[PDB]
């Protein structure tokens, strides 16, 4: 079996290999990439997402979110406090201000140390889940707005036509902006392109060991776990690498830089943080291999996990037994 230790693999496709998205995902899996839960793809030197990022300042972040932490440095939850709308230009200025700017640091490891030591004592602001794309329409390879839809995949595999659309989202981040431990909706794949700015550090648990993280999360967040048997779907829980190590949880870490893609694989738990001002674009996608994960995905029915109406059809068709209860939660 390929990649038995579940290491994060990094790929350098040629322009030729970059010409068929689906084929290259399958290729990566043939090499065992999915066992890690996360892979990095460095685009060929010939490729570009768009010409320049000189004209993005007028994008609106309708509802910036302040991420307020509760708990201890290595084991905390965060809630999202809504803030007044601002443009990307205004946001960039705020990110670079003395209050929010990245501290001096020696390297990525040093900054990681500072993050886990100090994150809870600050409340960074970020723009999340902004429908839109920064790929040029003329970018023909790995354009996240031009991928095949999950609805078409489900139709092709299962024969059923369903409503729903599948469009990309933008994220604007700053130092200490935090992504909580989660898998994707319906344990889908995701792909994330870092368009501009400072890095993102990722942590990931191999899919085969997802239940180990869930078990630890139940132990570390007992109140939340009592409230909901899939509370990680709420996307509020953080656990540091130190605590994961102490508890023997298998995981890996990697830093994504501007111009790099990251793919998360079905049931790959991941979390991370931004190093400073940046802009990323992400979208969920599916392959034939996803279907069996979709059928088995745990669901939040307690009301907390709010998702797009596009997920309705996936639960309805793949998980009919769970549908009524889940629907009540929405
Ligand atoms: Na994700
Ligand atoms: Zn819930």
UniProtKB/Swiss-Prot annotation:
Cofactor requirements of the protein: Fe(2+)
Binding-site positions, Fe cation: 182, 184, 270
Binding sites annotated in the UniProt record for 2-oxoglutarate: 126, 192, 200, 235
Residues annotated as domain JmjN: 8-50
Reactions accelerated catalytically: N(6),N(6),N(6)-trimethyl-L-lysyl(9)-[histone H3] + 2 2-oxoglutarate + 2 O2 = N(6)-methyl-L-lysyl(9)-[histone H3] + 2 formaldehyde + 2 succinate + 2 CO2
GO biological process: cellular response to ionizing radiation; chromatin remodeling; double-strand break repair via homologous recombination; inflammatory response; positive regulation of chromatin binding; positive regulation of double-strand break repair via nonhomologous end joining; regulation of gene expression; regulation of protein phosphorylation
Molecular function (Gene Ontology), one example: chromatin DNA binding
Enzyme kind, highest EC tier: oxidoreductase
Top-level lineage group: Eukaryota
Subcellular location: Nucleus
Family: Belongs to the JHDM3 histone demethylase family.
Purpose: Histone demethylase that specifically demethylates 'Lys-9' of histone H3, thereby playing a central role in histone code. Does not demethylate histone H3 'Lys-4', H3 'Lys-27', H3 'Lys-36' nor H4 'Lys-20'. Demethylates both di- and trimethylated H3 'Lys-9' residue, while it has no activity on monomethylated residues. Demethylation of Lys residue generates formaldehyde and succinate.
Protein name, entry field: Lysine-specific demethylase 4D
Annotated source species: Homo sapiens (Human)
Lineage, highest ranks first: Eukaryota, Metazoa, Chordata, Craniata, Vertebrata
Gene that this sequence comes from: KDM4D
């Amino acid at each position: 079996a390929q990649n038995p230790n579940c290491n994060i693999m990094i790929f350098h496709p040629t322009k030729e290999e970059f010409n068929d998205f689906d084929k290259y995902i399958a290729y990566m899996e043939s090499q065992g990439a999915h066992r890690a839960g996360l892979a990095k793809i460095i685009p060929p030197k010939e490729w570009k997402a768009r010409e320049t990022y000189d004209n993005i300042s007028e994008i609106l972040i309708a509802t910036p979110l302040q991420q307020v932490a509760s708990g201890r440095a290595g084991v905390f939850t965060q809630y999202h406090k809504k803030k007044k709308a601002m443009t990307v230009g205004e946001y960039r200025h705020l990110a670079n201000s003395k209050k929010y700017q990245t501290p001096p640091h020696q390297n990525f490891e040093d900054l990681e140390r500072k993050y886990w030591k100090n994150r809870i004592y600050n409340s960074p602001i970020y723009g999340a889940d902004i429908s839109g794309s920064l790929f040029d329409e003329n970018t023909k390879q790995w354009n996240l707005g031009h991928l095949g839809t999950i609805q078409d995949l489900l139709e092709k595999e299962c024969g059923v036509v369903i409503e729903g659309v599948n469009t990309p989202y933008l994220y604007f981040g700053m130092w200490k902006t935090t992504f909580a431990w989660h898998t994707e909706d319906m344990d889908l794949y995701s792909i994330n392109y870092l368009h501009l700015g400072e890095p993102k550090t990722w942590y990931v648990v191999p899919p085969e060991h997802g239940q180990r993280l869930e078990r630890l999360a139940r132990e570390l967040f007992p109140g939340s776990s009592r409230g909901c048997g899939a509370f990680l779907r709420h996307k509020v829980a953080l656990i540091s690498p130190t605590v994961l190590k102490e508890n023997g949880i298998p995981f890996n870490r990697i830093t994504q830089e501007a111009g790099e893609f990251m793919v998360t694989f079905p049931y790959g738990y991941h979390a991370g943080f931004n190093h400073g001002f940046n802009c990323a674009e992400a979208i969920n996608f599916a392959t034939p291999r996803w279907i069996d994960y979709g059928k088995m995905a745990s669901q939040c029915s307690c009301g907390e996990a709010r998702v797009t109406f596009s997920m309705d059809a996936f639960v309805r068709i793949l998980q009919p037994e769970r549908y009524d209860l889940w629907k009540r939660g929405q």
